[PDB]
Amino acid sequence: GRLRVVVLGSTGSIGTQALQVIADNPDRFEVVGLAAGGAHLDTLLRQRAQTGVTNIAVADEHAAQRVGDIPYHGSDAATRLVEQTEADVVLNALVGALGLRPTLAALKTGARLALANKESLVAGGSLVLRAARPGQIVPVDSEHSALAQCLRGGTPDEVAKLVLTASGGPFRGWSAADLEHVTPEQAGAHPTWSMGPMNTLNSASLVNKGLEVIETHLLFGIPYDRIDVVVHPQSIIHSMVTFIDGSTIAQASPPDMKLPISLALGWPRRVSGAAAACDFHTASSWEFEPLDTDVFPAVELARQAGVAGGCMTAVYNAANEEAAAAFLAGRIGFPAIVGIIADVLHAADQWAVEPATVDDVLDAQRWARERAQRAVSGM
Amino acid sequence: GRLRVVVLGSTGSIGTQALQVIADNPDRFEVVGLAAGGAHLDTLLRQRAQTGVTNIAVADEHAAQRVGDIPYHGSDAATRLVEQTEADVVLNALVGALGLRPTLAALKTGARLALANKESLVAGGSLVLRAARPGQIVPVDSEHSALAQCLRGGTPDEVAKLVLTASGGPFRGWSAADLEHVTPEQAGAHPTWSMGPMNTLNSASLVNKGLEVIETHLLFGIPYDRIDVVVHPQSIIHSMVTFIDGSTIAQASPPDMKLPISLALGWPRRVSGAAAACDFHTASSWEFEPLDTDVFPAVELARQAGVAGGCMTAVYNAANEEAAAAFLAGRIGFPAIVGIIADVLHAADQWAVEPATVDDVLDAQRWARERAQRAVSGM
Ligand SMILES: NC(=O)C1=CN([C@@H]2O[C@H](COP(=O)(O)OP(=O)(O)OC[C@H]3O[C@@H](n4cnc5c(N)ncnc54)[C@H](OP(=O)(O)O)[C@@H]3O)[C@@H](O)[C@H]2O)C=CC1
Ligand SMILES: [Mn+2]
Ligand SMILES: [Mn+2]
């Protein structure tokens, strides 16, 4: 009675940690599908051999050709893999708003969607939500996993606030002037989490936290004015829920994604030995500080976009993707990332309309990328 | 609807705070009984006048002589009140040995027992556990209330460890050499108005934490070797549960006993506005450090007593009461408190037998008191 898992983005950080959790728990889990982009064929072939799964999607046609006998190849490969593979859980660890169609396909199959790809939910918004039954989307994200656990501390009507923690990034405490000179190398560091290149930059810019505020509203149905963000440099407390009696329930663990991965895969059942627990035989401190919203307005912009609703959250994410690419390429400065997002959101009148189809979401993103490029061109 | 509440020990700290919670929540609670010792008879009489509750009990027959219209007076007045009063919740906030019989009576009525009286569990042990049905006892103290909330984080089978937080008391971080100089005043002997000198002393000696560890075992059925203590000077995290996957769930609030009191009264339902929540607008830190068990062995000793079982925890507590009072009277030094507890316990193996009656518990306490007296005097 074990769970069949499709792993999308298997060669990345989350995909590989997920495979390790599955390998350590053959009793509970079985890999039945793998999807990757094709940039790391060494890893993918290793995964094919180690798991014995030949049911693979490779996005890059040239890379799929070089491997040979890949059953699904091309831009729709991951989507068709999901549509055609019998599974109990789809782990979406793809990166960027491109995880949207596989997310929608997964929900349509009725399987659990263990969601690491927050962008697909942020972009899909109510379109993704309509495709899901209650509890079908289970968060892999450390914060959202923590929130889901802490919500067990009371009934829904007893929730006052959801409190997301943020690491603060490498630039915690820096001034606006300090941020002007930030290099791609400087933004490529993270004090607590080891992640891919986009999540690391997003954590530095605080856009990751903005995306997580939106994800929180969408997953848990809590109003934006009841979703708080506190800076916690240690990343040990992964988030908390405050109840109407004044009690706060918090989730805590040394930073290790295998914990929320393991919990997402086998929800509601915890997976014995998934990760190390906090060690209370040695001294430590858990520090909290307010976010400097003047220097880091990305979270406030996310709330604005979220409150607007419809396709506005897709716009927020798409504008970030474009500005982020420009920064990494050395075309714009670091403060310009969130500056461009604000510029694009301000122009995004038409996009408050609720998406009826995936094409509405794609239209919004297409516009947002263009408007983002316009803003880059002007600086 | 409205829960009918009997308040035993209505004139003490817990009792009066509970009456405030009840006054503030007339939708949720109604007082249907009040019981007190008699030393604060005037307060009880004012309480009858304020609540309109005439169903009252006074233990002290002398005190009762002052009134003429008390329905329940004399020894076991509180017990008789419990036996003869229809109620949904009995709050047992009586102090010491006079709490045990009312606890037993409350359990037999089938009411929920909101338990503050430590002696009921620490001394009464298996007598109380054999009488109680699952979930019948709801703990009132902050650590136990924290644990009950955090246990919501998983199934019973998913619990790895219970971690109680401890303030560390006034001598946190003190060497054994430092402790030799401790005076009653330093250990918290002030004529404070609401509470006896023992509470502050028991905190300082770490015996209170030991008592809490024993009660934790009895309340939640977790072995002593899986009940840990961490020193946390802020007392914001009130305790935590570590699950088999590595996740820790923690309960946090600014110190305020109205929170755990309100939740014990309303269990399982939280009481809106009971206490203030953690506020993250100003920076703070939550510090943890190990307890030096060489310098503070009171908790290790409690586990030893608890593992031994039967009436051994009764012995532990009674030896403390005697030794702690001897320290306050200047008959011994501070380090000798836990020293005498150890010496009495090590001589106490005849008391490992399970008590059949309340008198068996009383015999054990009698022996332990006499034993500690000889240890103090040198006889
Ligand atoms: N990493 C973390 O610790 C955390 C991650 N997340 C979220 O999870 C998601 C992934 O995180 P992360 O593992 O770090 O990302 P990574 O960059 O480390 O891995 C990205 C994965 O997606 C694959 N991929 C890229 N492009 C395509 C494409 N066009 N088609 C199909 N597959 C593609 C890559 O395969 P390949 O490169 O071989 O072509 C790779 O396996 C993100 O949305 C992130 O926000 C959330 C919380 C923390
Ligand atoms: Mn996250
Ligand atoms: Mn306590």
From Swiss-Prot, chains A, B:
One of its GO terms (molecular function) is 1-deoxy-D-xylulose-5-phosphate reductoisomerase activity. It is an enzyme of class 1 (oxidoreductase). It comes from the Bacteria. Transmembrane segments: none annotated. NADPH binds at residues 11-14, 37, 117, 119, 196. It catalyses: 2-C-methyl-D-erythritol 4-phosphate + NADP(+) = 1-deoxy-D-xylulose 5-phosphate + NADPH + H(+). Its EC number is 1.1.1.267. GO terms for biological process: isopentenyl diphosphate biosynthetic process, methylerythritol 4-phosphate pathway involved in terpenoid biosynthetic process; terpenoid biosynthetic process, mevalonate-independent. The keyword Cell wall biogenesis/degradation does not apply. Keywords: Isoprene biosynthesis, Manganese, Metal-binding, NADP, Oxidoreductase. NCBIfam families: Dxr. Belongs to the DXR family. Catalyzes the NADPH-dependent rearrangement and reduction of 1-deoxy-D-xylulose-5-phosphate (DXP) to 2-C-methyl-D-erythritol 4-phosphate (MEP). This is 1-deoxy-D-xylulose 5-phosphate reductoisomerase. It comes from Mycobacterium tuberculosis (strain ATCC 25618 / H37Rv). The lineage of its organism: Bacteria, Bacillati, Actinomycetota, Actinomycetes, Mycobacteriales. The gene is dxr.
